[PDB]
């Protein structure tokens, strides 16, 4: 586990606009602090829909393809300490569960976003940077920039994955 960077190293998108970040995004890159065993099945692209509600939370629905069937994951992101930051969950961690901090590093709303997450699940800590696109196409100059940003947070290139584009389940 590479240690998570201090939040002073993680930019926050200026003048974040929640109603423009709304909608469907594909997970087109991920860089995270664990592992990566080459002896596996390739990680398939999935989609996340951020639906902004009048109470300024997002209802966040992911859809993806397993082996044979579609899967869904639904949860709420609530505004954090400043615009572009969120935490997981309406009520803070019930019985035994997951907590997360979310910071939108950069977005232009109609093409891509880079979003930093720190997560605890079953007392285990991890972090990732997720690269989102409004379309599935990922070109080389954006792959290069995502690798550079990931390296700036302490992650080397072997911890960076560009999920395989697929048609099942996600559109």
């Amino acid at each position: 586990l590479i240690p998570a960077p201090p939040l002073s190293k993680v930019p926050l998108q200026q003048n974040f606009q929640d109603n423009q970040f709304h909608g469907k995004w594909y997970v087109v890159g991920v860089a995270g602090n664990k592992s990566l065993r080459e002896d596996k099945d390739p990680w398939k692209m999935y989609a996340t829909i951020y639906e902004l509600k009048e109470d300024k939370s997002y209802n966040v629905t992911s859809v993806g393809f397993g082996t044979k069937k579609c899967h869904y994951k639904i949860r709420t992101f609530v505004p954090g300490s400043q615009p572009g930051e969120f935490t997981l969950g309406r009520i803070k961690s019930r019985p035994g569960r997951t907590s997360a901090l979310v910071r939108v590093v950069s977005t232009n709303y109609n093409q891509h976003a880079m979003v930093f997450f720190k997560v605890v699940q079953q007392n285990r800590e991890s972090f990732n940077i997720t690269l989102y696109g409004r379309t599935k196409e990922l070109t080389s100059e954006l792959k290069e920039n995502f690798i550079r940003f990931s390296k700036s947070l302490g992650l080397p290139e072997n911890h960076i994955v560009f999920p395989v584009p697929i048609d099942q389940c996600i559109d």
Partner: peptide, 6 residues
């Protein structure tokens, strides 16, 4: 399936 984000 949901290997990124939260």
């Amino acid at each position: 399936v949901f290997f990124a984000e939260d």
